[PDB]
Design an enzyme around this catalytic site. Structure first.
Site, PDB file in Angstrom:
ATOM      1  N   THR A   1       0.852  -1.177   0.000  1.00  0.00           N
ATOM      2  CA  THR A   1       0.000   0.000   0.000  1.00  0.00           C
ATOM      3  C   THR A   1       0.891   1.231   0.000  1.00  0.00           C
ATOM      4  OG1 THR A   1      -1.968   0.990   0.993  1.00  0.00           O
ATOM      5  CG2 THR A   1      -0.183   0.331   2.456  1.00  0.00           C
ATOM      6  N   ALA A   2       0.264   2.384  -0.226  1.00  0.00           N
ATOM      7  CA  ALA A   2       1.019   3.628  -0.298  1.00  0.00           C
ATOM      8  C   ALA A   2       1.737   3.917   1.011  1.00  0.00           C
ATOM      9  CB  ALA A   2       0.089   4.781  -0.668  1.00  0.00           C
TER      10      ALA A   2
ATOM     11  N   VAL B   1       9.225   5.069  -0.524  1.00  0.00           N
ATOM     12  CA  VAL B   1       8.024   5.881  -0.668  1.00  0.00           C
ATOM     13  C   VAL B   1       8.452   7.245  -1.182  1.00  0.00           C
ATOM     14  CG1 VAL B   1       6.180   7.068   0.525  1.00  0.00           C
ATOM     15  CG2 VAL B   1       6.665   4.688   1.055  1.00  0.00           C
ATOM     16  N   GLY B   2       7.918   7.643  -2.333  1.00  0.00           N
ATOM     17  CA  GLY B   2       8.296   8.884  -2.967  1.00  0.00           C
ATOM     18  C   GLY B   2       9.799   9.050  -3.055  1.00  0.00           C
TER      19      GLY B   2
ATOM     20  N   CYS C   1       9.127  13.249  -8.233  1.00  0.00           N
ATOM     21  CA  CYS C   1       8.093  12.274  -8.521  1.00  0.00           C
ATOM     22  C   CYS C   1       6.722  12.847  -8.180  1.00  0.00           C
ATOM     23  CB  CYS C   1       8.333  10.982  -7.746  1.00  0.00           C
ATOM     24  SG  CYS C   1       8.115  11.130  -5.966  1.00  0.00           S
TER      25      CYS C   1
END
Lengths: 469, 469, 469, 469
Positions: free
Chosen positions: A246-247, A296-297, A302
Site C-alpha cells: 500500500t502507499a 516511498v516517494g 516524482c
C-alpha cells in the site's frame, strides 16, 4: 556499511550521491559470481517484478521464472484468473519456451499481431499439434494484407527432439538461416521452442522452482475486505509468496492485515510494504512480516513528492531499513523506480536482499500490454502506474455512483506514460542480462563471490553535485 | 596539497569543485617554465597518449615523440607489427617530419585520401626518391575525378638542404605561396618535410629520445597468457616503457602479472593500473610497479558509473593516490577522460607526475582512423573506446563459437562515438600547444618554474554548484 | 561584514550564494539616498566604465561624466588622441548634450548612420552654426535612398535659450510632437541639445567635475616601456585618474611600475590591478597604489577559468580585499563582469568603494562601436574583450614578423561576442537609471542613507544551489 | 521544527532543500483531517488570496469565501467600490452560486463573453426574474454571429426549489444532459445556481462567515496618507480583516502606520508585512500587529533578487518568523509565490498559520481579468504583478507631470506575464481541491488530524541538488 574517512554528510543520500571504491579482488571473471538470494524467496537473481497491471503478466512470469527471477501478480485479478495463470506457469518447461501458435487460415494482420508478443521473432503454424512451418516478420510484411498464413508460411525449419543438449542445439543453429529451433516432443507434437541465445542463457541462469520442480510465483493482496480469506484462497491456488502493499505501510490497518494473515500460518514468507523508517520496519516485522518493502516517494520530482512533501531518498532509507531488519533477523526489498543497473548495484550494496523493478520492464515484448507505434514509427507501450482508474473503480466493489465519484474526486489522473521500447534490447532477457552483467561487474570490482560478501566488504564514498555540470 | 582555511568538504571532489588561487609570482612569461617530467618516463611534457586502437597509431607516435610526449601501443597488436612500428618510429628525424609520398600516376581520389592523413596540407610526388612537385587540397578539388597526379601536380616548391636552421627556413617561407618546406637530403633525395609552424615548434618543444637519440615508445600488455614472455618479447622489440592496464587493477591477477614481469627485471619502468585507492596503490607499488595509473569510472554519468555504482571523482582519487605514491617513493598517472586543459592543470596540481589522454585525440589527422564527413560535411572520426568488439574477440584466442558467444552475452555494445574534428585546430600539435599553453599559464599564475614547484606551492579552493546556473 | 548565525560555509562565495536580509529602515523613498563615493575618484555614483576599446569611447565619457560616473580610456590610444578626447570632453556642457550635426546636402544613408550613434533619436541640420531643422528615424526611412537631408529635413522644432530651467523645458515639451529640445546659444548658434528625460535626469544626477568645473576623465597605462614617462604625459594631457591594469597584478613588474609612477608624485590617485588576494592588495598599497582593482577569472565557466584553473569567486575575493584595504586605509574597486544590478549591490555591500562595468555597456548607442543588425533585424554590436588582436599587435611596437608570430602563437582567439542591444533601454542612461534604482532600493531595504552606512549596517545570508532548480 | 540527526546545513533552506519523513499515522482517510485555522482569520482552509488587481476580484471573493478561504481587496480601489463589493459578497448564498444572467435580445458574441467569466459553463436567460432557458458553449458556437440569445436559447433545464438537499440535487442530475441545476426561489424567480460538483463540494468545504452568517472579506491599505482614516472607513464599509503591505515592512513608516491603526482599536486582527527577519517580526508585533506576512524576494531568479541582492529563501525565513511569533504569541502568513501544493504543505509544516497565494490564481475564470486566446488558441490571462503602472500612477494622487515622470523614471516595467489557463482544472475550485488534497495527503502521511498537530509532530530532512539532474 562502510564509508570513507571524513564522509559524514548532513543530509540523506540518494543513488547520485554515492559511489563504490574498488578493493582487493580475487574473482577472475563475471561468471565466477553467485547471485543466489538468501531472503527465502528462492530467486537465483536479485530481481523481482512489480505487481503492476501493465507489467505483471503471464509471459513475464514464465520468462522471469525461467531466468531465476520472480513475479508478483496484481492484487485486483480474479481468483479464477490467478489460479489459471499459476497452473499455466507451473506447466511450463524449464529449458524451452512456449512459442506462438498460428492457424494456417489466419490473416496476415492477426499473424503479425500475435507474432509481436514474443521475442523469438517467429511463429509456429500448428495443425493437430504438429508444426508445418514458421512465419516471421518481413515474411508477412510487404505482402497483400488479405493473404493468409498458408500463403506466406515457410515450411523449412530446424527440428530437434526433447532432451537435446543446448550446446548441440547452438552448434546445429550455427549456420541456420533462421535462429529459431522449434522443439518437438517424442510423439512428434510441438513441445516448445528454443533459441541460440536462449540456449546460451540456459547454461548461465538457473530457473527458480519450488519443491516440485515447477516455476515459483507470487501474488499481491490489499488491506480491504477479508484479507485472511483472500490470502488463504491464493495460497490454495498455488501461490508461493504473498505481498501486502500500500502507499503507506506504517498505518495500523497494515498491522491488522499482517496479523490476520500470519494467524492463519500459511507457511509462506510474507512481503509487506511500504515503509522507509526503521520504526516502521520493526513494527512490520513484529507484526509477522518476513520481508519488508522499502521506498516511498523516492524521486525528488516524482508525483508523490510533488503532491506532498513526503518521501525519502532511496539509498539512506534502504540502508536504515536493512540495518533494522538484520538487527531483527529479517530482510528488505528495494523498491522505488529502478532505472539503471547502478540502482540495483547500490541497492545490493546497501543491504537489500532483493530489488523490485517496475515501469522499466513495461517497454518489452513480454509485457501484458500490446506494442504500439508512435509518430516516428518507434515502438512504445503505454503505462498506467500501479493500476488504471478503471481497475481501482473495479476494486471499489458495488458502490453507488455518487459515492464512487465522491471518492474519485480527490483521486489524481491516470498519468499514463509512453514507455519506449529499445530495438536492440527489446526482449526481457535482453534487460536481465544487462542488469546481471552490471551486478557481476560490481561484484568483481569489489572482490566478492556472492551477495552476502558484497554487502560485507563494500566501501562507499560521497560526491557533490558539481560533477553533474 | 594546501586548501584555503575552512574548506573541509564532506564529499569527494572533482574538477568542477576546485580552483587554484593565484599567488606571488616571479615567472616573467610562459616560455620561462620547464615542463620536463621526473617520473622516469623521459617525457619533456606531461602528456601521455592512451593505448586505444582508434588513437594509438604510428603517426601519433611520431608526432608526439617529436613534441616531447610518449605513446603506448595497443596490447592486441601482433609482435611483428609492434617491432615494425618501433623500428619505423626510431628511424624518424628529430626536426623534420615524414610527408606523404604520391606516385604521379595515382588518381585524384586516392591522392586526396592519402593527403588528408597528415596536417601539412600537401603531398610530395616522388620519382626514384627525388621530389618533382606538390599536390594540395583545392588543387585536386574541382578537377575531373579521372585525372591523375601528373595532371594536377605543381612542380614549383621551396627546397632546402638538411641542417638548415629553422629560423632561416621560416624566413625563407615568409613570402612563400605555400607554407610547405619539403626537405632534401644532401644526395638530393627526399629526407623529410618541414613547416613554418613546425619550424617554430622545433625551438619550443624538445623531442623525447632514448640513450641512442631515438624517439621513445611504450607498449601495453594484459594479464592473460604468459605475461612475462610477452613483456620480454616487447622489450626485445625496442619498447621503452611497459604498461599493464585493466578495468580493475586491485585484483590479485594484476599482482601476479606485476610480480612475474618484475621478476624478469627488464630494466624498464612499469606502469600499472587502474586503481583509485591508496591501498591499491600501495599493493601495486610493493608488487613491483614504479608508476600507477589512476581513474576508474571518473564521470558521474559515464558508462561504468551508469552500469555499476563503482567509481570515484578524479580529483580526490588522484590526490590520495599521489600522496600514497610519494609516501612510498613512486609516481602516479592521471587517466580518466581529459577534455580541457583545466583537467591537465588540476591533475598536475594534485601531485600526478603525468597525464593520460584518450578519446580527445581521436578527432585528429594523425589518428589511425580515417577522416569521414558527416551529414553537414563537418569532418569527424569514429571511436570505439578501449577496443572494438572484433578486437576483443581476437584476444579471446581460439575458442569455440559457443563459448565466445557465451562470454560476449554479458559484454556491452561497441558504443562507437563520432568525435568531431575542429577545423581551426585539427592538427595534433594544434592541441598540444593548446594544452601546454594552459599549463604554462597555470604555472605563471602560481609562480612556479617547473612541475615540482607547481605541486609544492599550490593553494586550492572549493566552490558550490550554484555557480553553474 | 555581518552574516547570520551559523552561516560559516566551507567554500568561497559568489553572488549567487548570498542575499541581503532586510533590517530596520528610516529612509522614506529612493531619492533620499546619497550615492557619492569616498574613494577620492570624485564620482557621484559608484559606476566606472572599463577601459575596453569596444566600450571606452568619447560619447561614453561625455554621458557618464554628465551622469556622475567616470570612464577610463584604453591604454593603447595615441597620446594625441588622448589629449584631443580630454579637451573635447572638458569642453562639454554640464546640462545639455552635444547632438548630431548634419549637412543639408548629405545622403539619407549617411544621415541615419550618423543619427543612430546617439540616443536622442534626432539630428540637427546646421548651416553656419544655426539650426534649420531636425531629421528623425521614420523620416529618412521609407523614402528614396538617393534623396538628401534638405528633401527630408523637418524645419519645425522647439527652441529655447541657454539657462532655461529644465522644469520649464519639460513643461514646454509636454505637448511637443517631438521630444527633442534643441538648445540655442544667446548669439543664435547651436549650443547643445536637451531632452525631457534628460531634463528630468538633470535634477537627479550630479555630473562629476574637477576643481575647474569640467568633467573628470581617467586613463589607463601598461607595464611595458617607460611607464613614468607615459603617466606624466597623460597627466599633462589633462587626465584626472591613472589606472595600471594587467592580467596578473601581483607580479613584481606591477610593483616596479607602481613605484616608478609614485616616485614622480603626479598628485593623482592610483588604481592598480588586478589582484584577488589580501597579500597582493597589501603589496600593491605599500608600493604606492591608492585604489586596488579586484577580480581575476571570476566566472566558473569564463575563458580564464577554462584555460587555467586560476581564479576566485567575486564576492569572497572582494570581501577580503576590501577588508585588507580598510585595514591599510585604502579602497578597492569591484571588477569581474557585472551583469545585473544585484552584482553592483553586493559589491557595494562587500566593502567596495566603486564598481567597474565592462561588456554590459557594449550594447549601447554611445559605445564607440557601430550598430549592426542581425539575422532577425535585432540590433547588436560586436565586442572584442579587453582589446582586439590588431590592437595587441600594435602594442608590440616594431618587431620582426617572426617574433610577432612566435608571441602570437600562444595567444588565444579574438573571442568576439555579439552583444545584443535592448530596444526599450538602448540608451546608456537607460542602464544607469536601472542600476541606480536597484542600488537605491537596496539602500532603502537595508535602511542606509549613504554607501558607508550601507557597508556598516548590512547583514547577509547564504543559500544553497537547490533553489535554482 | 524537528530535523533528522546530523542535518545542520550551513545555508538557508528553500522548498527544494527539504522533505517530510513519514511517521506513525492513525488517520484513516483524507476526509478525517480538520483544516480550520487558529490565527483568528476565521478561514476553514489555510488559503488566502493576494491583493493583486489582476487577481483580487469579486467573483474570487464569492467563490473563495464559499469554499472557506478569504480574499483581500486591492488597496487602490475606491471606498465606494469597496463598500459595493462588500455588500454584494455578503448578500450571496452559502450553498448556491450566482450564475450569469443574459437578456434574450443579446448577441452571440456578448453571450459567450459573459458566459466565459464563470466555471458553470452555462448562462441563464432572465425575463422579469424567471428563467426561460440556458445557453452553453457549442450552442452559441458554430451559429451565425448576428443571431441572438432567443434564437439559440435552450428552454429545457433542470429546476429545483431552495432548500433542496445537495445529495438529492446530484441524484436528480445523475442523468441530466446538462450538469447545471439552476436554482429557483419559492416565489419562482432566480435565486442562484448549483452544480453537481458544487453540490459535492458543499458537503466537503465549510464557507467562512462572520457572526452574522455572511461571507468574510478583507481589505488592504498602504502607508501613505491618513492610514487611520482609511482603515476606519474600510472597517465601517464592512471589512473583516485589515492588511498593511509594502515591499519593505521593517521600515519605521510601517511602525507608525501600525501604531496609528492600532490606536483607533477597530477590533479586527491586523496583518502586516512584509518582513523576513525575527527582529522585524518582533518589531511589527510590538507595534500592534496580530499577523505578520513573510517573504521578500523569495526566488533566486526573481525580479527583486536580480535587481538587488536582497531576499531570503522562503522556508528558513518562514521557520524563523513563525518561531518568533509563537514566542510572542502571534501568527505568521506565508507569502512568496506559491506554485505547487508542496509549497503550501511546507509552509504549514514550518509553522505558518496561513498561506498567501498570488499569480497562480490569475489563470482562472473567476479572475477579474478577461480570458484571452493565444497564438495556439490556448486560453491565457495577462498579469501585472502587484499593480499596473496606471494603478500606481493613480495612487500618486494629484501631482505635476514633471514630478510624476521623475518618480517613474526609477520605476521598472509593468512586467506583464501571460498566465496560461489549464483546461482540465480551469475553475478556481479545481485548484482549491488540488491544494487541499495535497495538504490532506501530507497530514495523513504525518499522522495529524489538524494543522497544530501537523506542526507539532513533523520531522524534516535535507537533500542535495544532485537529485535534480
Amino acid at each position: 556499511v562502510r564509508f570513507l574517512d571524513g564522509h559524514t554528510p548532513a543530509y540523506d543520500l540518494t543513488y547520485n550521491d554515492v559511489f563504490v571504491v574498488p578493493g582487493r579482488s580475487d574473482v577472475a571473471s563475471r561468471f565466477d559470481v553467485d547471485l543466489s538470494t538468501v531472503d527465502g524467496s528462492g530467486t537465483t537473481i536479485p530481481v523481482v517484478v512489480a505487481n503492476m497491471t501493465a507489467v505483471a503478466g503471464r509471459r513475464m512470469a514464465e520468462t522471469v521464472a525461467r531466468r531465476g527471477g520472480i513475479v508478483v501478480l496484481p492484487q485486483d485479478l480474479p481468483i479464477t484468473a490467478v489460479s489459471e495463470t499459476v497452473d499455466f506457469v507451473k506447466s511450463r518447461d524449464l529449458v524451452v519456451d512456449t512459442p506462438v501458435t498460428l492457424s494456417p487460415e489466419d490473416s496476415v494482420s492477426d499473424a503479425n499481431a500475435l507474432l509481436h508478443k514474443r521475442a523469438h521473432g517467429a511463429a509456429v503454424v500448428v495443425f493437430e499439434g504438429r508444426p508445418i512451418g514458421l512465419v516471421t516478420e518481413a515474411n508477412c510484411a510487404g505482402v497483400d494484407r488479405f493473404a493468409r498464413v498458408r500463403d506466406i508460411a515457410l515450411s523449412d525449419f530446424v527440428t530437434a527432439p526433447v532432451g537435446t543438449d543446448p550446446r548441440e542445439v547452438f552448434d546445429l543453429l550455427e549456420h541456420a538461416p533462421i535462429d529459431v529451433a522449434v522443439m518437438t516432443a517424442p510423439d512428434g507434437t510441438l513441445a516448445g521452442v528454443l533459441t541460440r541465445t536462449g540456449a546460451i542463457r540456459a547454461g548461465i541462469y538457473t530457473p527458480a522452482v519450488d519443491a516440485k520442480g515447477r516455476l515459483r510465483i507470487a501474488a499481491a493482496v490489499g488491506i480491504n475486505g477479508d484479507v485472511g480469506a483472500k490470502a488463504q484462497a491464493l495460497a490454495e491456488a498455488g501461490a508461493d509468496l504473498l505481498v501486502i502493499d500500500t502507499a503507506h505501510g506504517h498505518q495500523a490497518k497494515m498491522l491488522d492485515a499482517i496479523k490476520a494473515v500470519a494467524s492463519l500460518d500459511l507457511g509462506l514468507p510474507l512481503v509487506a510494504g511500504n515503509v522507509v523508517s526503521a520504526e516502521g520496519t520493526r513494527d512490520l516485522i513484529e507484526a509477522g512480516a518476513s520481508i519488508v518493502k522499502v521506498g516511498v516517494g523516492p524521486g525528488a520530482m516524482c508525483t508523490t513528492r510533488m503532491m506532498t512533501g513526503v518521501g525519502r531518498p532511496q539509498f539512506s532509507a534502504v540502508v536504515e531499513c536493512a540495518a533494522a531488519a538484520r538487527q531483527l533477523g529479517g530482510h528488505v526489498w528495494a523498491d522505488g523506480g529502478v532505472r539503471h543497473p547502478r540502482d540495483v548495484a547500490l541497492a545490493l550494496a546497501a543491504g537489500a536482499s532483493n530489488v523490485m523493478i517496475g515501469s522499466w520492464f513495461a517497454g518489452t515484448y513480454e509485457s501484458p500490454g500490446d506494442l504500439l507505434f508512435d509518430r516516428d514509427d518507434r515502438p512504445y507501450k503505454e503505462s498506467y502506474g500501479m493500476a488504471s482508474k478503471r481497475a481501482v473503480a473495479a476494486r471499489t466493489a458495488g458502490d453507488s455512483s455518487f459515492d464512487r465519484a465522491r471518492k474519485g474526486l480527490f483521486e489524481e489522473g491516470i498519468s499514463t506514460s509512453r514507455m519506449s521500447l529499445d530495438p536492440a534490447r527489446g526482449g526481457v532477457e535482453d534487460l536481465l542480462d544487462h542488469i546481471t552483467s552490471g551486478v557481476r561487474s560490481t561484484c568483481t570490482y569489489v572482490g566478492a563471490a556472492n551477495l552476502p560478501e558484497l554487502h560485507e566488504k563494500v566501501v562507499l564514498g560521497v560526491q557533490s553535485a558539481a560533477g553533474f555540470a
